[PDB]
């Protein structure tokens, strides 16, 4: 099926033969109904083309300066904006707000067939926003608590999650080895039945050396462009499980990117928008959305079974993708394999 959203045709990454996810055929069978995806990111804005698919979440950011919302941990996972001034994070230049989590969440589950905006990969799933990134990024320990809570595990001082996730998406990372705090959290999420999907990073380097994609028991995702070959920035290596479209842009908001829900604010939030972004951060929620399609078709699927289905049903690369996992995720084939 093809949705009626007016920007669907701009979302090449869902349907073109070279670099797309092969979604229309998948949507004949699965859309994510009944499945919950936790998006561990900067938070969200209640975009008109997203909010109906948002569930209550949690804000794990403990450092008040990073949190930028007046306090420590709290129940409102909305994104206040992560804009920074020059040298606020050390030696950085000034940066506008990313609205990264709004973009990622829309790839997972933008409201679809509403005649407005964009479509989402798992458009009948629901997203639990777990805010773990703010100004200058996020703390490993807050991210790890996010993983635990998102899965339905217990974190001291935090109310129980009433919407435990089937799938975690982490479009985030840094350099270096996977820490024990992170691996512990991942092990907890997997033991609770939650599959963990992670962006491999954007350093054009060996993915062995970038976390949390280098943790064990995760689905680590490389990025292809619209050509179906490796996006120039994508990490690559033996620990990549699969690839998905993350886009390959040559200027800001280039339509060669991945189009999703977004916000027009430079610092503070403003009007809803749609924007094209790129990264392994954009590839990961494609894969998280397919994991949700799989879980609708196979409700008792384990994390290892979901990873196996994703990896075993990929399609060929039409252009060079060295050490990009088994292939490009093929939503239709994955749903068939889970049915
Ligand atoms: Ca707070
Ligand atoms: Ca908050
Ligand atoms: Ca829409
Ligand atoms: Ca893996």
Author numbering: 145 to 483
From the paper:
Previously, we identified Pseudoalteromonas arctica PAMC 21717 from the Polar and Alpine Microbial Collection (PAMC) as a microbe of interest because it secretes a high level of a psychrophilic alkaline serine protease. Preliminarily, the domain structure of the translated pro21717 gene was predicted based on the results of the sequence alignments and secondary structure predictions. This analysis showed that the Pro21717 protease precursor consists of four functional domains: a signal peptide (residues 1–27), an N-terminal prosequence (residues 28–142), a catalytic domain (residues 145–483), and two β-sandwich domains (residues 489–593 and 611–708). CD-Search was used to identify the catalytic domain to either the Peptidase S8 family or the serine endo- and exo-peptidase clans of subtilases containing three conserved amino acid residues (Asp185, His244, and Ser425) that constitute a catalytic triad like that found in trypsin-like proteases.
